[PDB]
Amino acid sequence: HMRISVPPLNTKRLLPTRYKTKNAIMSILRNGEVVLEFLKFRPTYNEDRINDICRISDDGQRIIIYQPDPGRGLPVREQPPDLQIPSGDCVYNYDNLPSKHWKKYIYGARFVGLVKSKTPKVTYFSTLGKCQLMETMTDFEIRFYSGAKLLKTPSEGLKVYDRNGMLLCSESRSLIEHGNECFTHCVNISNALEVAQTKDNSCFPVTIGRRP
Amino acid sequence: HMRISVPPLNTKRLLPTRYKTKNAIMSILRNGEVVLEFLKFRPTYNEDRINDICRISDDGQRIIIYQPDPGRGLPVREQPPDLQIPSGDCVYNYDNLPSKHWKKYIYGARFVGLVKSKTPKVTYFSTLGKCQLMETMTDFEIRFYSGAKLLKTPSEGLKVYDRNGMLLCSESRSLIEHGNECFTHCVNISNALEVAQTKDNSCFPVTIGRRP
Numbered sequence: 220h221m222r223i224s225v226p227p228l229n230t231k232r233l234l235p236t237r238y239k240t241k242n243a244i245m246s247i248l249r250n251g252e253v254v255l256e257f258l259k260f261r262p263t264y265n266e267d268r269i270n271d272i273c274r275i276s277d278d279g280q281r282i283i284i285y286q287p288d289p290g291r292g293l294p295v296r297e298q299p300p301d302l303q304i305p306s307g308d309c310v311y312n313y314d315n316l317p318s319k320h321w322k323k324y325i326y327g328a329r330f331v332g333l334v335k336s337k338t339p340k341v342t343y344f345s346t347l348g349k350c351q352l353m354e355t356m357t358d359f360e361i362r363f364y365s366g367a368k369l370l371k372t373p374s375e376g377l378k379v380y381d382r383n384g385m386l387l388c389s390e391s392r393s394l395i396e397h398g399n400e401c402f403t404h405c406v407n408i409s410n411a412l413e414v415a416q417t418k419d420n421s422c423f424p425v426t427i428g429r430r431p
Numbered sequence: 432h433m434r435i436s437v438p439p440l441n442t443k444r445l446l447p448t449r450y451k452t453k454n455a456i457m458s459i460l461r462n463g464e465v466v467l468e469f470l471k472f473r474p475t476y477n478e479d480r481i482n483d484i485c486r487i488s489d490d491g492q493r494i495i496i497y498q499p500d501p502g503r504g505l506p507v508r509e510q511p512p513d514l515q516i517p518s519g520d521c522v523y524n525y526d527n528l529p530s531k532h533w534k535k536y537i538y539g540a541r542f543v544g545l546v547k548s549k550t551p552k553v554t555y556f557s558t559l560g561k562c563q564l565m566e567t568m569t570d571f572e573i574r575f576y577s578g579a580k581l582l583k584t585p586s587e588g589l590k591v592y593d594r595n596g597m598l599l600c601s602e603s604r605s606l607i608e609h610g611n612e613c614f615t616h617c618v619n620i621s622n623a624l625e626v627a628q629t630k631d632n633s634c635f636p637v638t639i640g641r642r643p
Contacts, residue, residue: 232640345632404632411627411634415620419612420557422620426638428444 223321225328227279227313228253232354232423233334237298244269245330246299251277253327254299261292268292272299273323279331284320285309336372341405342426347397349430352405359402364430369398435533437540439491439525440465444566444635445546449510456481457542458511463489465539466511473504480504484511485535491543496532497521548584553617554638559609561642564617571614576642581610 230251244256259270274283343350348363357373366382412422442463456468471482486495555562560575569585578594624634
């Protein structure tokens with residue numbers, strides 16, 4: 220009757236990264252794996268200590284959740300620890316992950332979504348600039364030849380800047396019109412290319428045409 | 432009952448060029464126009480002289496065929512003459528071009544086809560190299576990371592070269608297999624992208640993915 224807030228995450232055309240924050244270290248590895256190292260400063264060591272580790276496969280299906288050196292934690296090295304044969308207590312999959320853990324998997328999904336938002340899926344060179352539709356399919360930016368730039372998120376909204384940055388008309392609603400016209404073309408093509416996609420071959424990321 | 436050998440030519444994503452030969456000067460202009468300047472050396476001027484001009488629109492539909500300065504001809508300048516208001520004797524379109532002219536239009540079509548063959552439509556970065564499917568849709572070349580290269584035309588056939596160039600097996604039929612696998616992917620995508628294509632927006636040329 221009750222399911223988890225977010226659908227299973229995925230690394231598709233996502234590059235290896237490592238984002239550091241004040242509560243966890245989130246990492247995407249070459250195998251496409253997601254590794255979250257949650258943090259708690261314990262005075263016993265007088266520094267930040269990994270408190271829990273959450274690991275998710277490259278398709279959000281397989282999950283490992285544990286809390287190493289229970290009560291002492293770990294030294295933050297540059298990269299997360301390597302995968303050791305998991306207990307099986309701490310092994311779950313998406314369709315069974317107990318509610319008490321959902322929040323962490325959610326952290327991972329939010330992270331992957333963020334990297335999804337900063338990752339180009341489609342690049343269109345229009346007659347006015349460089350369209351770039353991200354892997355989130357809801358983020359979009361245009362880099363006009365003139366120097367104007369347009370941004371679009373499903374959250375912060377719209378922020379068209381001219382050569383100096385203005386919001387406000389005449390110049391704007393020309394730009395905006397192009398923006399959406401460009402946006403339709405990029406989503407339309409992502410959807411068009413989903414057809415030619417196989418398991419062994421990839422269609423994205425993709426760059427289309429050039430400037431004059 | 433009888434039609435012309437070739438279907439109407441077209442400049443799609445074709446760049447401005449000028450190919451020189453021993454009988455004509457073929458040119459593709461920015462407007463997408465095709466201009467053939469046929470040649471005859473007349474001793475009267477003791478040099479090559481344009482004998483006839485053939486001009487074809489960017490969709491092989493509209494044709495202009497004439498023979499300037501009848502009996503004397505023209506000095507070969509760097510570019511063809513500009514379009515003057517045509518007589519209308521020398522104005523035709525595809526569906527009426529009289530047989531006596533077909534051969535020239537054919538020259539133009541062959542030229543445009545040649546440039547079509549040297550023009551990239553799709554670029555795939557596979558796991559083994561750089562696939563490149565030309566605008567002819569029958570020409571294809573792979574540039575493997577190793578240094579092997581594969582070629583394919585509908586005419587001269589097949590010529591797979593290794594790091595030194597060999598034909599002949601073991602290494603070959605690995606390569607060839609990839610070649611066709613790559614080839615299927617590129618044609619499949621051109622056809623997939625034909626759907627997202629509009630009049631105001633373009634889908635080609637296109638480059639897909641990167642190397643590791």
